[PDB]
Design a protein around this ligand. Sequence first.
Ligand SMILES: CCCCCCCCCCCCCCCCCC(=O)OC[C@H](COP(=O)(O)OCCN)OC(=O)CCCCCCCCCCCCCCCCC
Ligand SMILES: CCCCCCCCCCCCCCCCCC(=O)OC[C@H](COP(=O)(O)OCCN)OC(=O)CCCCCCCCCCCCCCCCC
Ligand SMILES: CCCCCCCCCCCC(=O)OC[C@H](COP(=O)(O)OCC[N+](C)(C)C)OC(=O)CCCCCCCCCCC
Ligand SMILES: CCCCCCCCCCCC(=O)OC[C@H](COP(=O)(O)OCC[N+](C)(C)C)OC(=O)CCCCCCCCCCC
Ligand SMILES: CCCCCCCCCCCC(=O)OC[C@H](COP(=O)(O)OCC[N+](C)(C)C)OC(=O)CCCCCCCCCCC
Lengths: 80, 90, 491, 75, 192, 506, 54, 60
Amino acid sequence: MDLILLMLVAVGLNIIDIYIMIEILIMGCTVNTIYSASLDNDMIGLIYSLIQIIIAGVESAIGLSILVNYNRIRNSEEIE
Amino acid sequence: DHVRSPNVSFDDIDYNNSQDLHNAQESLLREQWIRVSALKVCRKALESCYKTSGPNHYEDCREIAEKYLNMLPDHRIQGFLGYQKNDPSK
Amino acid sequence: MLVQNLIIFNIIGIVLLVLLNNNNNGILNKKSLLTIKNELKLKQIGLIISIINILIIIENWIGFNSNYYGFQNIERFLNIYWGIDGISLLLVLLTLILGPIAILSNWKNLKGYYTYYVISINMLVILMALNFICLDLVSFYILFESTLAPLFLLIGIYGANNKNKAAYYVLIYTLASSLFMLLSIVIYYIIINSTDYIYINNIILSINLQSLLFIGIIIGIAVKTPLMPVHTWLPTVHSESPLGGSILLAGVILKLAIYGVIRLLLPNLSEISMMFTPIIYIISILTLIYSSLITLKQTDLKVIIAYSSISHLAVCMIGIFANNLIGINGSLILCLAHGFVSPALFILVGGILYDRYHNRLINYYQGLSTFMPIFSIYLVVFSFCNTGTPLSGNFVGEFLSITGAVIRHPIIGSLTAASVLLSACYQMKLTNRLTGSVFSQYLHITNDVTNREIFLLNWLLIPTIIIGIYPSFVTNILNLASSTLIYSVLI
Amino acid sequence: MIASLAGWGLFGVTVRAYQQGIRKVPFSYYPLGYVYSALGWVAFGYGFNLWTERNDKLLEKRVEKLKESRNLRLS
Amino acid sequence: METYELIDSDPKFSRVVRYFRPSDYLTWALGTIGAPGLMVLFEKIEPAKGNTFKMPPPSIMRIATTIGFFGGFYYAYTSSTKRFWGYSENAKEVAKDRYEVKKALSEKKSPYGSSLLNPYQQDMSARNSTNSQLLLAIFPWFNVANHQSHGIDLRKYYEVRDGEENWNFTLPPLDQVKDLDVAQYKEYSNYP
Amino acid sequence: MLFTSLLLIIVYGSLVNKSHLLTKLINRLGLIIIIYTLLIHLNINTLENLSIGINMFNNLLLINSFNNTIIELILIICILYVLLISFNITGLSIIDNLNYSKRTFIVIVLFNIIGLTLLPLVNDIMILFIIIELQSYSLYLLTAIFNESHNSTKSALYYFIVGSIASFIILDATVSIYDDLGLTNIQYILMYIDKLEIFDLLCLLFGLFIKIGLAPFYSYSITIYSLSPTIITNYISLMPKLSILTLIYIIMHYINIVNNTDLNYVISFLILISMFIGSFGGLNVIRIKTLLAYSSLLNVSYMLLAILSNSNESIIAYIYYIIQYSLTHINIFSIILVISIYLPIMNNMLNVMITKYSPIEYINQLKNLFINNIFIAIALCISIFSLIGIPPLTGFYGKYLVLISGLNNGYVLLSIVLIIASSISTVYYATILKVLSFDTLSFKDIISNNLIINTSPENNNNEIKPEISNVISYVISSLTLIILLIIIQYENIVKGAYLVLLYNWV
Amino acid sequence: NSYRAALEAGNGNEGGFDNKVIKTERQGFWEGVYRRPLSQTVEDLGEGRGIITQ
Amino acid sequence: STADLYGLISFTPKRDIHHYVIRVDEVPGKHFPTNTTGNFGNTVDFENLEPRRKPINPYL
Ligand SMILES: CCCCCCCCCCCCCCCCCC(=O)OC[C@H](COP(=O)(O)OCCN)OC(=O)CCCCCCCCCCCCCCCCC
Ligand SMILES: CCCCCCCCCCCCCCCCCC(=O)OC[C@H](COP(=O)(O)OCCN)OC(=O)CCCCCCCCCCCCCCCCC
Ligand SMILES: CCCCCCCCCCCC(=O)OC[C@H](COP(=O)(O)OCC[N+](C)(C)C)OC(=O)CCCCCCCCCCC
Ligand SMILES: CCCCCCCCCCCC(=O)OC[C@H](COP(=O)(O)OCC[N+](C)(C)C)OC(=O)CCCCCCCCCCC
Ligand SMILES: CCCCCCCCCCCC(=O)OC[C@H](COP(=O)(O)OCC[N+](C)(C)C)OC(=O)CCCCCCCCCCC
């Protein structure tokens, strides 16, 4: 019951909700990596996980920076 | 002046040597126009014989006309690609 | 050095015509001597160059041997080998002669931009001329599609009311089809590793792979020469295209397809041609019969001649696919004969009548012999030449092509004789109507044929009669070259 | 190689000439632009014919290793 | 291909700068003053403002020199490196390298030098900096450590070539040179 | 050279005042930085010594003669691109002041160039997922450089969201490969090419397919390109494809080791659909940037046919195609950025709103270009004719070489479709050429002082004042003749393509 | 059946052509030859309009 | 000659799971940051290492 694209119902109906879903999806790839690194007793995989957390952090900032500028644009009249 | 025909049968050459393959194509052509010319001379006799004989042209030109009809089907330009690209022995 | 002289001279000539005219754009108003008298000093340069190109081929003609087998004047320019044989000599010669007549036909019936028009005509003439003197399938294609760029722009800029409709038709019909020829050219380059003529003439391919190559190439040929049922682009183009475009289009461009059969099909796909020859005859003969019945029920003046050219290009294809020297020689002579009579008709129909009365509806005109006697004289003569009169060059082409078909297939090839009757119906019905009954009430009496218009007709009529009366000027050159295409084994 | 370099030098001149038509100015405007363009495209010409001459020495040596490999298949 | 003798597959930063031919400094000289010149030439080709020539601000002529300086060094750095790898003529350099390496061996000192890095870190610093010059255009990285993964056989410094017998060098066997792999693991095979 | 001077420009950028003259001169320093990088790169990198492939930085990056060429291609296109902002394109301040307001425009470009060049060189999944982000982020920042605009910002937000999804798809595939094998380096993975799940490399490509805008993901690329300013769309519609099509080719080179038949069918399904959508898509459109966006999709479709076939003829076809389509794309967007000075001015109907970000937005704004500037129109016609495929322009050999590699590997269906989509596409390239010239003679006698160029004052009325800047006109002239006159050097240039090697050797 | 797969199995034309080796068995789809047995032409083209007879 | 040159270059040698190019020029694990000899599973001895697979540069 994922082949019916059920997850789209679970997403909210705002742009900020789309941002959340992406970060949840990227977090799924880190938990899988930590699962793989620990079982193999490999510290190379845990380095990958650290990079995924750091890189996905930057992407969050750039997304909200664009959204904040975009939201400011509508209320950018500044007449007074 | 009057350059001759370099008689070269395809079965003697290897087609890779392009200069040879050109000779075997040209030679097969130049021996086919000679047969057409010999047809014209043979038919040039049939016309003169027919007129001079008059009513006798069924007997005084019998062999000439017979030979002309026998040689007519195959005394025409046939080209080299027919025999170049085919091997009759198989 | 033919090609090296030919390309360089025109490239030099194009730059000369570019420099003189476009130097005066600047910021200043066009008060210039060159554009005085409708750019007369820039048209004359263009007319001189098209005459000079004729002198280039003649320089290499006197060295040409009519007895040596193979390609002559073999030269490597731009990493491409260029050669001339018996067939390529006459088609290049014919192409260059139509150069000056195309320019001279539109000498004083354009609204402007004569410099652009002149350069476009020369580029079409040179690229067509270069197309017969290449030596590989790839180079054949390059000069077979480069003409689209000037031809698409020439029709759109200098066209009739429906030029937009026709500009698409010439561009897309000749590209959506010739692309199907690019596939077959590419297949040769993959399995043989070269597209050179002599290299691929000696290689036999499997029975299936010849059919796949034949279809890909016949598709690009059956469109370039209008053959049913993909003939529905030429009549539109001929109606809308300018007089210079119509002269070159039905004079040389449509003959490229006949020459395309010689280079791309007969030698290297020889076996499959014999398999396709009965199919070609059914397609061609129905093209002849239909395109002559369709012409009966037409109305437009220039469209009527457009369908006439299709019928006389079906006779060429019937003759060329015959497997004998009689069919092949007559098919080539007819292309040469049709290279002068067909352009001449467009001068009468779309270059004299249209340039004065500015209409193309056959209902208006009748009885033009009353006040235009000289126009009628060339109308009747070029009508009887176009129908296959014995003293014309069309008859020699039409007799040998019909006789060549009968030798290959005596039963279905007999239907090729329909061209003798059908060409008389639609053609004379035009000539009978244009020169019959009282002078039309819709047309005012105007100037008769001028000196310029007389000149073109006299220099498009004489080559037609000369070939008709004594075609040995043409047959002797072709006899060696045409004998190579024949494929037959007699035991 | 002077035969080849002159070809590029002419090609560089034509670019400058074609540029004037873009800018809508008479072709006799600031003639030095033709010399500068000719020198520039000769410099690219010199560095091009070297690149082609350098290729030929590379390609033939790679060809030799290819013909040996073909003879193994042709055996 | 125009190969030569492979002096050092991973030349050290201090040795690359040392082996700068006089032409190499000239290249660095051009690049340091070429960048201010190119800014001037650009104004000649088309001015930034107006339709007339105007020399760029003196402040820009200062930063452009800095870009040219750090830009022209790498052209010198890359030119010298190709002589070590064997991609460029190195007859002059081979003479210099063999003299120093022979001098190092003669004095019972390592050719590479003493290091502050344990045997793993030497190996690690080899992989990071080796062939880094192939990306020196994109971003800098240099071999600043005294490691030993230089991809050579030290016995090629033992045999005497032409024109070297005059130096009168005596070379001990490799098992007695300080700071080498063969002369370090004498007590424990795990530790140097 | 990039890293050392990019930091210098970042510090120097904010130290000096914000003035369009200082910003423009700083942009020129960006041009000088890129030029030095090319000289330094060409000096140390050769095709002869990189044929084997040389590992760098602990085997994180691997460079060979194939990735090396694209790096040289990326740098050269950027040099021509920076000429659009380092020099005047039109001359009039109103339309050219948009390129000089943002100081960090050149800085962001240099951030992207570092990302662009290193992406083909990735040899480990850890550095793949990083380098794709360094390039991907630089695109989102670039699309939002003009934050006053409403369309440019909404483009970047739409671009950020889809690009993040593509990054997650790419990230997930690399984690899946890591979970099966436990290894990271691609060369280590090659040992286990027969035992990992091969479709996980396809899931990796599906991420890269999104970023270059391949159907069915084409929807966002057309929208984004049609909205961003013309100065921005010229860079984001070409550069990401240069540095990703090369990476796709390297991955496809690895995948063809096993020669999975199921994987070819899935990719061929995408190739087949893209030619359909890229051809029928542009038939009914009014915007010029939307048309070129559909043209980009179709020419990406043609290149991917060569990549999928992936034989020794693919390298010759792909190397030649990527170079010629890049110059042509630069040539067209250079012309469209210059012919904005012939627009008419009102003195209404349809209330058509034209903004200073995209002065040329509809195709019918090219009318009478044959009249206004005939030499420019011929350059535009030649560029358009190349994309059509009129021989012997550079475009013709691009399709001729793709068909050779496509047919050599048995892609008979896709080859026939590629030709049909080449014929269908010709309709909406001829529309551009119809607009320019087809009404020349009906408008030869026109009274019109209402052009944008006519606003500039007359300086002397005696001296000859050229209508266009020197540098931008020369680039158009240099690229126009390369496309038209490639027939001379084609045999030699193709020989240069023979020498490019990707583990062919013998 | 593609040319590449056929070429790698010896069904292509990599080693050039020769005309003394006349193959009785029908050639492959992609294979090319200089010369062919007459009986194959008779099977394909059929006797008639110039093959063997006139 | 032009046909023979293109025949050689355009040929694509078959690669399968048995023969393909791996650009690994050494063996990992000679030195580890800490605890170099772990479970004593690292059997490969670098003192007696067999010669590696050198790449074949075709231009040399
Ligand atoms: C309690 C159970 C709970 C299970 C949770 C899921 C419930 C089922 C939800 C729908 C399932 C449909 C997909 C089924 C799995 C995906 C297909 C698959 O993996 O194969 C299974 C099935 C048969 O496979 P089989 O032949 O047995 O393979 C054996 C090989 N040794 O393959 C099939 O033949 C299935 C038929 C699919 C073909 C028709 C549907 C495809 C066309 C519509 C697709 C929708 C649009 C997608 C467009 C793609 C976008 C480009
Ligand atoms: C002799 C040589 C000639 C060469 C060309 C020969 C082939 C030409 C084919 C033309 C035949 C169909 C065209 C004319 C039929 C009219 C189609 C149409 O108008 O749509 C009808 C239908 C909806 O009806 P309606 O919108 O009301 O239209 C009424 C018009 N009287 O809407 C429909 O039914 C549309 C059908 C759905 C579209 C399916 C598209 C699938 C692909 C079709 C081919 C496209 C090329 C694909 C490959 C290239 C791209 C990858
Ligand atoms: C045989 C080998 C030829 C190779 C060289 C070709 C040179 C082309 C001309 C360049 C100069 C130019 O673009 O100039 C433009 C010229 C001349 O315009 P005009 O009417 O005099 O301008 C007058 C302007 N007034 C009225 C304001 C003063 O017109 C042309 O465009 C005609 C020739 C090219 C048309 C088609 C080009 C597409 C080619 C596609 C691949 C074949
Ligand atoms: C108003 C103006 C309209 C246009 C008018 C037409 C102008 C004609 C100009 C003639 C020039 C000429 O003659 O050039 C000739 C020279 C010399 O040739 P070579 O070096 O010996 O090469 C040998 C050539 N073979 C082997 C065919 C003989 O080659 C050139 O320079 C080549 C032109 C540049 C080609 C473009 C690609 C190069 C960069 C690569 C980018 C991918
Ligand atoms: C000595 C060997 C090096 C050659 C020079 C190379 C750089 C050119 C700098 C010259 C000075 C300059 O640009 O001067 C400015 C001139 C003229 O400008 P204008 O258009 O008349 O503007 C008006 C100027 N007034 C007011 C003085 C009249 O512009 C040119 O010449 C433009 C030529 C374009 C560059 C050609 C080089 C192409 C190289 C291609 C490599 C891929």
